[PDB]
Design a protein around this ligand. Structure first.
Ligand SMILES: NS(=O)(=O)c1cc2c(cc1Cl)N[C@H]([C@H]1C[C@H]3C=C[C@@H]1C3)NS2(=O)=O
Ligand SMILES: N[C@@H](CCC(=O)O)C(=O)O
Lengths: 96, 98, 148, 49, 50
C-alpha cells in the first residue's frame, strides 16, 4: 500500500500468513525478496510488447496486371484499335 | 571432431578471429551461472540481495555489451550489413558454354 | 504512322518492365516503428500496463531516460492506459485500431499470438531478463525441500 | 554556471527535448521511409497527345 | 554498317531503360527564392518583421 506498505494481492497472502504457498506466474523482483522467500527461478521471460496484426493484403489472380493501373489497360485498347484503322484507311486509297 | 560448450562461449569465440567456428542448432537446456559461497556462510543474503539491484539496474547488460559486443572484432558482425561488388565473372557463366 | 506506333510501344511496355521488376523486389509491410521508442516520442498510440504490476512499478523505478519519459507519459496518460486484468488490455488494443499499445510478458505475448484470430503481434525483443520462481512465506521450513 | 551546462551539454539534451523529442509534423519521420508503386495515367497522358 | 549501328543502338536504349518509372515520379519543388534579394527587387511579395 501507499504509505502503509500493506501488500495486497498474492503477496500479503504469504506476508500475512493467509496462504501456505504461491505456485503461480509470479515474477521475482527485488522488493518481493524483503517480504517473502523464493525458490530458484524456473522460467525466464521479459517485458514484451504486444500490438495488433496490421492486415496484409494478398495478391490476386491477375497480379501480373497490377503494375499498370486499371484505366490505361482500357485506354491502350482504345488507342490500339484507332491506330490500326487509320493504317487501313491510308492502305486502300485508289492508287492513282 | 565436434565439440560441446556453452552458448556464451560459442557466441564469443565466433566473434574471435578468424571466425572459423560455427554454432549449429539451438541449445539443449536452460542453465545459469550463479555466485556460490561456502554453505552456511553469513555472506549469502547480502550478496544475493546485491545481485538483484544490478540486474534491475541492468549494469550486467552494460557489462555484457562490454565483454562481448563492444569487442565485436571478427568481421561479419560488421561486414555482414554492408554493400556489395559487381562485374560478373566467367565462373558464374561457364556451365552455359558447356 | 508506324514509327509513331513503334515509338509508342517502345516507351510503354519497356516502362512496364520497370514497374514489373518493382513488384518482385519486396512485399514487407513495415508494421510501424518497433523497439518502440516512438511511444516516448509520438503522441499517437498510447500504451499501458497491468494495475498492481511489477512493470508498472518498474518504470516508476526505472532510471533509463526513455523509460522515465515513458513513465513521465504513463503517469500523465489521461485517461488510464493502465488496466486491471489481462484480457482487459488485450481487447482494448483489439478495438484500439492501432491507437493503444500494451505491455506484457514474453510468455504471454507468444501464447496469445497462438490464439485465434492471431490478431496480435509481438514487436522487437524483450527489454529485460526476468524469471518466475516459487515463493513461500519468509522463514518457512518448506524452502529447501521445494527448491531442491 | 552557464559554462558548466554548456560543457556538460545539458542544453543540447534540452535542445533535443524542446525541438527534436517533439518532432511531430511528418516529413522528419516520413521522409526516410519507403514508397508505393503502380504507375498512373497522369504520368503517361502526354505520350498519347 | 548496321553491325556498328546495331551494336550502337543496343548499348543506347538499354541504358535508356535502366530506370524509367523512377524518372516518371519526381514532383520535386518550386521554391522561387532563397536569399531573397527580389524582396529588394520585385514589388510582388511583401515582407515584415516583429
Ligand atoms: N527456458 S525457461 O525460461 O523456460 C527456463 C528457465 C530456467 C530454468 C529452466 C528453464 Cl526451462 N532453470 C534455471 C535454473 C536451473 C539452474 C540453472 C539455472 C537455474 C538454476 N532457472 S531459469 O534460468 O529461470
Ligand atoms: N509476474 C508479474 C506480472 C506483472 C508485471 O510484469 O508487472 C508480477 O507478478 O508482478
Amino acid at each position: 500500500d501507499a504509505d502503509t506498505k500493506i501488500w495486497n494481492g498474492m503477496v500479503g497472502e504469504l506476508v500475512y500468513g493467509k496462504a501456505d504457498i504461491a505456485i503461480a506466474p509470479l515474477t521475482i523482483t527485488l522488493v518481493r525478496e524483503e517480504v517473502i522467500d523464493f525458490s530458484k527461478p524456473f522460467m525466464s521471460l521479459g517485458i514484451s510488447i504486444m500490438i495488433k496484426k496490421p492486415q496484409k493484403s494478398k495478391p490476386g489472380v491477375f497480379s501480373f496486371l497490377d503494375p499498370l493501373a486499371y484505366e490505361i489497360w482500357m485506354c491502350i485498347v482504345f488507342a490500339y484499335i484507332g491506330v490500326s484503322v487509320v493504317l487501313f484507311l491510308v492502305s486502300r486509297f485508289s492508287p492513282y | 571432431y565436434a565439440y560441446l560448450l556453452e552458448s556464451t562461449m560459442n557466441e564469443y569465440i565466433e566473434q574471435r578471429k578468424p571466425c572459423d567456428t560455427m554454432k549449429v542448432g539451438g541449445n539443449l537446456d536452460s542453465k545459469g551461472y550463479g555466485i556460490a559461497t561456502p554453505k552456511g556462510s553469513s555472506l549469502g543474503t547480502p550478496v544475493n540481495l546485491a545481485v538483484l539491484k544490478l540486474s534491475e539496474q541492468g549494469v550486467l547488460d552494460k557489462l555484457k555489451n562490454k565483454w562481448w559486443y563492444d569487442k565485436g572484432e571478427c568481421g561479419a558482425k560488421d561486414s555482414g550489413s554492408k554493400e556489395k561488388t559487381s562485374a560478373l565473372s566467367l565462373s558464374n557463366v561457364a556451365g552455359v558454354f558447356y | 504512322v508506324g514509327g509513331v506506333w513503334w515509338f509508342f510501344t517502345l516507351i510503354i511496355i519497356s516502362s512496364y518492365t520497370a514497374n514489373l521488376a518493382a513488384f518482385l523486389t519486396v512485399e514487407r509491410m513495415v508494421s510501424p516503428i518497433e523497439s518502440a521508442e516512438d511511444l516516448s516520442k509520438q503522441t499517437e498510440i498510447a500504451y499501458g500496463t497491468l494495475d498492481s504490476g511489477s512493470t508498472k512499478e518498474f518504470f516508476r523505478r526505472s532510471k533509463i531516460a526513455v523509460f522515465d519519459k515513458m513513465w513521465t507519459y504513463m503517469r500523465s496518460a489521461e485517461p488510464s492506459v493502465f488496466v486491471r486484468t489481462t484480457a482487459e488490455g488485450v481487447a482494448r488494443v483489439r478495438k484500439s485500431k492501432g491507437k493503444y499499445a500494451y505491455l506484457l510478458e514474453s510468455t504471454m505475448n507468444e501464447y496469445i499470438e497462438q490464439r485465434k484470430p492471431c490478431d496480435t503481434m509481438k514487436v522487437g525483443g524483450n527489454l529485460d531478463s526476468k524469471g518466475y520462481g516459487i515463493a513461500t512465506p519468509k522463514g518457512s521450513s518448506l524452502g529447501t525441500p521445494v527448491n531442491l
